[PDB]
């Protein structure tokens, strides 16, 4: 549901970028530069929502964690592949639709490629194109700047990129489509776990975390009371503070080494067939 | 009510895509191309959307779970034959009635085959057909560019066209439901069991993954609980939260062995005469 | 009142159907293949919904359950043609009306019979009909393609054959209604009960497949509880569940015989003078 | 009340047919065939809706299940007369409704009998009436297909005809409202009882019926909760259910001979005076 | 109150049906034709709500009944002629409220009588009047037909003829009110009682068939329980059902000539110098 | 108050049937004839509602039945003058109004009056009057049917009568005005009793005529429960009906020489000196 | 929440002054002088948002108070970097979306390198250029004050303008995310903690800063409560505020060396492998 949301939240954000009013397009009509505004008009907007999508996703800054201070190669081809699946998932859900949209919008091909298109090889027209003047007068059709002499061989090429604008988009959405699957498929056969189990240890980690930031919230609010209370002489608690205070104690927190021992991406490694869900999980088993 | 509700989303989804403003269509007025813009534009999204249910549908990771870990073949011409039938159903709404709904439209069709109508054979107008230029003039006709000289001609094979199109859709979702009645006279005498315990039987899925999707959170919620307590020393729990650590205290969690045996597709096996009707059920019967 | 509700949401949906923007028609202007056009319009939608009508009534895979299972023949000139009879109701209510709805629009049969008119039997218009374009201008008509020599005589044909359809109609919507009555005065005489002891029936097949629903997923709740209790050591239940848990214990399940003597379709048998309304209360007068 | 609530219905029910789009006229202008398209117009409506109100009326089956197994001819002149009349009212309530709806609205007698109007017996014109085309000329008055030499002679024999059937109609409504004075004032007179016993008798009969389905519902479920507790072992039962089983314990059903001894038509049998009111009182003043 | 709501009720249908789109009038243009059309559009809705205001008063059935076993003239120069003054006067007031409205309107009358002026009587034009000719131009005044040589002639008859239409319509509701205030002075100059006691008696009246109507619907609902119960075993009760169970036990109904004795039209006989309001009433005291 | 609401809504009656849409006024413009429709139009409304006040006030049929069973002449110049007075009120509230208000719209005048102007007399024209055509264009002038040579001759000639119309018009509300005051202060001066004492009996009549008939329904519905207790065996009645029952038991009713002493108009005899404020009260100090 | 809610506030104020009616520009078309207005237009805002998100964050003020009061070099490269990296986060989003949504709107740019613009460079025109007046003419063209002969060529210079200025827009943010991703990258990888553990903290100085945000106002309110009964002799208190005098009796306040020691910037000392989060968390443990 979360992910759908997410989803959702991704496909209505690119329908929002995705009809705006100067952002949409504004394409030059001018040879051997027209290609490379498509090329960033696609690229440079999926680029970014691909780098954002990395950004907001923190299972990432979980990885380089991982990698700074183990840095002994632990996450192998295991359940860390599975993070990075739902990285790229989480990250490149928006620059996909986004690449389909404006693609099944044809702008960008069609100002893209104007510039390569053959003179002689089009039809629905009569052979008026000097070759001095022929890329110049061939990059001005996604503008509407052809003559009357050449309008039919406007819209007959502009109709040509467009179909092949929407065609490559359809192929490219079916080959994403075609790659979730090959990778949720890949996922389930190379998993060492259940479906339920692996729903389970979901479910774990949702609570794990949820769990772990209440408490970590209303414990750093009781260490923050101490030190507080330690200053003034008393602290301004609410009811609901007030009954923080009176029913969690605390003395100490843990020290770093423990920290780095909760920290690191997630695990399936088995105390004796028993399963540990999490480096918490494994920790708490340890002792 | 759950699979009509399914029904009905796919069928708003499809009525959504039908009617979109640039998706819905743009024919290539070109010949030996707009054909392939036809396939393209009925069958990309058809199988798109085929692969999307396939996605969606969780029996389909079920399927190649069990295929997966067991691999012994036990899946024979079974229940498993059963679930692909939902898997199929719950998958293939989606691409045939995209394909019946952009049939009707005909739009596809008519832009698709008027490369291939001969000149001579349709009516309505005098045969002004130069040979050098028949098939690119005849490929125009979707886009409404037949000159007054042949507008009754383009009209007549349009017609014809739309009437072939929407003809080969009738068609096709007459066979499609003569399909659904094939697979489920199939299904309901290949059945090794009644109808009343088949919904008995559906009714027992249902009850059991509800169940166990609520006890799997809350004995994960309890787990992590014992976790996040082995950490700091408390956990910051709600008033439900708190009578459900009361409530289902735990030690430990079942082994990935366990979890094997209560994993797989459905079966009917039969312990002694009494009936199975799952895998944990058959799991909780063998101890 | 829930025949009736049936019958108005099939009413209404062949009411939204019969007015669709495309769906509802477009027909060839074109001798000898355009009344394979009404054909195709009238009966496959007729053909589509009826096999519908079938496949959502249960009553039918009940029929080809006792067919499957007893397959003794049991099922004579008995309540089974009763059943049959609602089959053929709650699936043929459909069809008829799409086919009345759609002939007193009248669309489908000009379009069809306008390439069999003579075109010297008609009148208000010259015999300017030559042989050779005969059949061609007479398929033209229901597309307003006659010319203005032409055009009193497209009217009339047009009204001619919009009177042939609505008579046609009307007469085929009076038979089925005769056909009605001559089934329910068939059933009303071939019965070997009351109509009172009919409604008893009635009422009683109503509430033993409503008790039975409800009790079937209370006793397959109580087995999923039973079952995930033994999985992890505890169920996370309602506290209505909770309440079906302490009120209704279950140990086992009846056995697939005992399942197949519960299922079938209806009957009348009378144990010595008393009679037993369905196959349970047969089932259960037998213990 | 209820007979006024149905009265209601109908005229409404007549109201929105009245006014239908396509459904309320399409008039052939053809001569020796407008007045079969009258004729079907008014009667197949009048027909279809006279077997509809013999239809949803269960009297009409009451009185075929009394001729079905009793067959004795003990139905004379007699109460079932009395049903034959209700039966007649509720269901001739809609024909003639649409005929004198029908009737005022014109349309069917002047596209009926146009052919059949003497072409030198009228006014307001010249007799520009060749006799070959005379009759085909007449037909086409109703589709204003008349021209400006017999414009007037068009709109004055429309006129007439209009006269002809709204004089038409208004006396079938009065010799209607006389047959319905006629048999009621045959009912109050060939009575063998009072109108304050024969209102207590309606009251009776309503009350029997009401009460007898009230407690058929609550019978049958009594039973069909015995023949569940004898499968499963036990009922998931409502709050109310529940006491309606406390309430109402059965354990068996009354045979066929007794079903037989309540059914049929009623009755005004007197049991030594002493009246009985239904063939359930009857037997029940039997024992 | 409740004849004034029926008063209301009737002067609002005869409102409604006074401006009918298509009910209200369609004049005849024909000589010896249009009078039969305003008999006709006057008397038949009139005969019509005459007689359903017969049909829907209850009074008439009490007449006919006691006209029927009777039979012995007893219904002499009494309020049963007081009983035939109210049927006169809750069925006549609908055709004659019907008839002074569609003379005030006066289309009826001058679409009527405009056969019969005669031509030279009349002036505000020539006389361009062939005798040949004479009365079929008279007859096409009321549908505004007449050339401009007399439309003023048209314009002048027109205007008489809805003069005397509109002064028959004033005398005839002038006539009916005295007629109303004749019948009610011979009614209290007639009558063997006062103004007051007649009010106790319309009082008395009301009370005894108000009472009457609900003891006769409880002490049926009694009965039909008490045969339900020796059907069954039970009665399906409503809690209100079973207070009227408790309430008032019944054993047995009274005889046909004990309701005889309680029906007829009422009566004013006095036993003794002791008022009988009512036949039940004299039927009590006689006990 | 109950004076004032009368007044007012036989002022709301006048004033809706005072811009009636066709009741209103239809002028026949004809010599020796429309003066005829203005006395009409005038007096048969007028007559109508001055019988239709009298009908409604029921005084009057206390008037005719003191002169029907009494017929003593005892109804002097008395009190019953001043229920004459009250009759003649509230009856001839609603003719004069009517009078008044078409009078002051003038069209009856101007219309009835037009037929005897003299044509030398007027002016604002020349002197084209034919005498044998002066008074048929004289009637035609509140048409608006006098040419352009007559048109300021017919306006003055309108403005002239319609100044008489409303002078007459005022004069006559004035005189009946005058009439109010001296009908009012001959009743306070003929009176033989105060003001106060006059207030006191109007009170007393209200409340004598609001007890009686809320006692006369009581003890109606009490005799009518004897009545059917008496038939069936028990009373359906209400909570309060069950209570008025416990409250007020009858044993008979009053003879009809009490209910005639009761009867009859108001007086003021005085029983030595005490004074008796209507019959009942002189029949209740009589015992 | 908090920063993406910052984010949000900044989008929106962007967004509002983007659209500005003045604010947004006016181009100077004068040569040499309108890149001084483009540079203005972009950096100015830019700067004086980069200013005001400096100005409006209080860690800068944190940052200056430990350079001050401390001078040591104490903040190297440390959790000091991390407070500047958030400094520079929340300053630094405005500038950059200011910058990038007047490149996106193109306006400014295309004002700026109008005058660097070749002449003979560009094309769609003839050269109608003079050199001595090239550069002036150059200029004007994006006020639209290009002639008719240079129309085409003024079209051109601004696609082209506008398409460097939306690459150069897409550029810069593709490097401030890659910026964005480098620093966050830098953050997680030079971090001596953990992500949690970065998390717990974040969550601590939260809670230190809200809690002593909260017993800061409390305990200068109770301060100031004690100076003011100390002038008076009383206090006007609320109900809470005395429940806040009589809770938290205060004497004196902490000395300065007492708030400098606990102010200064965010630090990660470790007191014998114990974490100390915060300065006055520090400070306490240092007690």
Chains 1, 2, 3, 4, 5, 6, 7 share one sequence.
Request: with cysteine; proline share 5%; glycine share 6%.
């Amino acid at each position: 549901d979360v992910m759908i949301f997410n989803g959702l939240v991704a496909l209505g954000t690119v329908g929002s970028q995705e009809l705006f009013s100067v952002v949409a397009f504004h394409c030059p009509c001018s040879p051997a530069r027209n290609y490379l505004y498509g090329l960033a008009a696609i690229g440079v907007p999926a680029l970014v929502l691909f780098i954002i999508g990395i950004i907001l996703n923190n299972h990432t800054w979980n990885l380089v964690a991982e990698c700074q201070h183990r840095r002994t190669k632990n996450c192998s081809a295991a359940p860390t592949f599975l993070l990075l699946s739902s990285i790229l998932g989480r990250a490149a859900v928006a620059p996909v639709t986004w690449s389909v949209i404006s693609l099944l919008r044809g702008e960008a091909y069609v100002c893209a490629l104007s510039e390569f298109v053959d003179p002689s090889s089009l039809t629905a027209r009569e052979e008026h194109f000097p070759s001095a003047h022929a890329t110049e007068i061939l990059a001005r059709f996604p503008c509407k700047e052809n003559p009357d002499n050449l309008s039919d061989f406007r819209e007959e090429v502009s109709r040509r990129l467009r179909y092949e604008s929407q065609l490559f988009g359809w192929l490219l959405i079916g080959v994403v489509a075609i790659l979730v699957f090959l990778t949720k498929c890949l996922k389930h056969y190379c998993s060492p776990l259940s479906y339920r189990q692996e729903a389970y240890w979901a479910q774990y980690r949702a609570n794990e975390d949820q769990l772990f930031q209440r408490t970590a919230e209303v414990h750093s609010r009781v260490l923050a009371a101490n030190n507080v209370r330690r200053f003034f002489g008393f602290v301004a608690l609410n009811k609901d503070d007030e009954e923080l205070i009176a029913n969690f104690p605390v003395e100490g927190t843990q020290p770093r080494p423990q920290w780095n021992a909760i920290t690191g991406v997630y695990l399936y490694r088995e105390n004796q067939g028993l399963p540990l869900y999490s480096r918490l999980h494994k920790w708490a088993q340890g002792l």
